[PDB]
């Protein structure tokens, strides 16, 4: 769960 890492 990272608030600064987008999916993909």
């Amino acid at each position, epitope marked *: *769960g*990272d*608030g*600064m*890492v*987008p*999916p993909g």
Partner: antibody
Amino acid sequence: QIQLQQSGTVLVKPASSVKISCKASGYSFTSHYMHWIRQQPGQGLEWIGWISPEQGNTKYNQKFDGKATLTADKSSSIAYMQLSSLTSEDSAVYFCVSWEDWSAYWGQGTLVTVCS
Amino acid sequence: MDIVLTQSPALTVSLGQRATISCKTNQNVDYYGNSYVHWYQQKPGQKPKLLIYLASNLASGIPARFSGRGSGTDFTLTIDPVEAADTATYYCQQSRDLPNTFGAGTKLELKR
């Protein structure tokens, strides 16, 4: 208790370059990315880019390409950002952030002031 | 295609009433039942602090008077009641696509 203690205040002359550090403790340094944030005086927050300490992989904001280079020493659990060709637009406070399970741990911030 | 987050610069609320921060995205940030907007609070001279993640989720050790809601392009952060501690600058940030982008920030102040 994850903590990130950052480099102290630096004051530099224009067109030089500086390196600041984010010392990570309390989590597996290579397990989570280290992001970097820039805040200009009186301005909002900008995401510079991230590094994965495990392999040294880096991803960047397009705006900071050629301005910031991210490095990591898993030996010392320290993250590094170098800002090169400093101008007055680069006078700012720079934060390092790492995330664990939707909790964000922020460094106290490093004040970079470039003289004009 | 950098995502633009629009949020008003200032909010002046009276002590103890509801305050509502708004964040508007130029692009849809929802991805598989979750929306990638996060909220921070930054007091003067302090580092930013996470309040809400994924639009609606309270962060650890964050008081219950904070709450976030919203979907698609429209999101709000709600402080009810507003306390004397809460004067600060509040940011929305999107993590749907790189680069991660923040709103300009809403300074919250108290009516006198």
